[PDB]
Structure formats: C-alpha cells, structure tokens
Design a binder for this molecule. Structure first.
Ligand SMILES: C/C=C\C=C\CCCCCCCCCO
Ligand SMILES: [Mg+2]
Ligand SMILES: [Mg+2]
Ligand SMILES: [Mg+2]
Ligand SMILES: [Mg+2]
Ligand SMILES: [Mg+2]
Ligand SMILES: [Mg+2]
Length: 141
C-alpha cells in the first residue's frame, strides 16, 4: 500500500547522496529520492540505474546477477510498519518488470528500465505514493 511504499522510499532514499559521485547522478537530474514518484519525473537516466545499484547494494537488496534478491527484499519491506501487506506484491511487481528487460546487456540501463516499469505498474496498482507522503515520513529511523 501507498503508506508502506512511502516508508520504504524514505528509508532507501537515505543512501542517494553517498551514491551520487560514483553513479554520475547530478542533483540536476534528481535532487531528493522522493521525487522518483513525482508525476513530473521521468525514470530514464542510465546514471539513475547505476545509483539504484549502489543504493541497493548498501542493503543487500540485489544479488550477484544485479537483480533483486527476493528474500532480502521481502525482509526489508517487512521491516516497515504494515510491511507484510506490500512485501509479496512489491517483489512480484519488480520481478515481472525484470523479466521484461532481461535482454538489456547494460546493468545500469536495465535497472533504470526496471525501475520505470515498477513506477508505472505501482501507479496502475494504486500503491504509488505522492511525494508529499514520502516527505511526511522522511524523519523516521
Ligand atoms: C525500493 C524503494 C523505492 C525504489 C525505487 C526504485 C525502483 C527500483 C526497483 C528495482 C529494484 C532492483 C531490481 C532491478 O533488477
Ligand atoms: Mg549512509
Ligand atoms: Mg561512475
Ligand atoms: Mg534537496
Ligand atoms: Mg551484495
Ligand atoms: Mg536477509
Ligand atoms: Mg552500456
């Protein structure tokens, strides 16, 4: 659900600044990770794919094939309030989007394509939060 997605986003996004330099993710491409969810942000930059790999690896959320680690991602989502309601559905959505991009050879580009698909399908499923709701939880943890 959208409030659970806001907690996951607010926490995951605390690794954006330490991953900017190695990814080339300029503040002029993305200032605050919460903006990922804005109607007005296109999820397309290779640099953002590279940043998400860096961010994921901080929490062991990707496996050695540079794809989501299903058990670690389930356990991470479940670590937030009401997380069990989102954990299976979010793992499913991400993995269905990874299957659509399996022929992309460039890991950074693949990840950003997976991320855009995940945004699209989260919006369609009614679990995409507003930027305001991520902001409301930024102080936690
Ligand atoms: C994790 C909370 C918000 C994340 C937004 C970026 C979406 C990244 C999902 C893809 C995860 C890595 C899988 C790509 O193979
Ligand atoms: Mg840190
Ligand atoms: Mg680099
Ligand atoms: Mg800022
Ligand atoms: Mg690792
Ligand atoms: Mg684990
Ligand atoms: Mg390439």
């Amino acid at each position: 659900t959208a409030e659970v997605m806001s907690h996951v986003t607010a926490h995951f996004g605390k690794t954006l600044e330490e991953c900017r330099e190695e990814s080339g993710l300029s503040v002029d491409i993305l200032d605050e990770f919460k903006h990922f969810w804005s109607d007005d942000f296109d999820v397309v930059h290779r640099e953002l794919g590279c940043a998400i790999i860096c961010m994921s690896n901080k929490f062991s959320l990707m496996d050695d094939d540079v794809r989501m680690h299903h058990v670690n991602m389930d356990e991470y989502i479940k670590s937030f309030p009401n997380g069990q309601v989102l954990a299976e559905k979010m793992v499913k959505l991400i993995h269905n989007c990874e299957k659509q991009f399996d022929t992309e050879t460039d890991d950074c580009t693949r990840v950003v394509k997976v991320a855009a698909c995940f945004k699209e399908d989260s919006r369609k499923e009614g679990i995409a939060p507003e930027v305001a709701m991520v902001e409301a939880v930024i102080e936690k943890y």
